[PDB]
């Protein structure tokens, strides 16, 4: 495992343990170390949502998407979940 993958597994272990602020802090180190890797932003956004920090989550999602290419094999469940939120938002 590279250092990034080790730091990432630690953030993920904290996240799975329900230690969300702790995970955020590790995820911040992913962003710092690899600023063009969407995974830090995506992981940090989930931990933020768990904490009810919705505004910073939105900021992390927008930032991570700047470094994400197209995804051409999207699952149907994902589309149902996204379209549900998109539409709830638009109402």
């Amino acid at each position: 495992m590279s250092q990034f993958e080790k730091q990432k597994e630690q953030g993920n272990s904290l996240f799975k343990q329900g230690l969300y602020r702790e995970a955020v802090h590790c995820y911040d180190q992913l962003i710092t170390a690899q600023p063009q890797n969407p995974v830090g932003y995506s992981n940090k956004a989930m931990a933020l949502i768990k904490l009810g920090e919705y505004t910073q989550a939105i900021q992390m999602c927008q930032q991570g998407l700047r470094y994400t290419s197209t995804a051409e094999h999207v699952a149907i469940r994902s589309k149902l979940q996204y379209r549900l939120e998109l539409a709830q938002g638009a109402v």
């Binding site: 995970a23 995506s42 992981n43 989930m46 931990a47």
Partner: peptide
């Protein structure tokens, strides 16, 4: 992993 999970 699932939508609700980390990566």
């Amino acid at each position: 992993s699932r939508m609700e999970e980390v990566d």
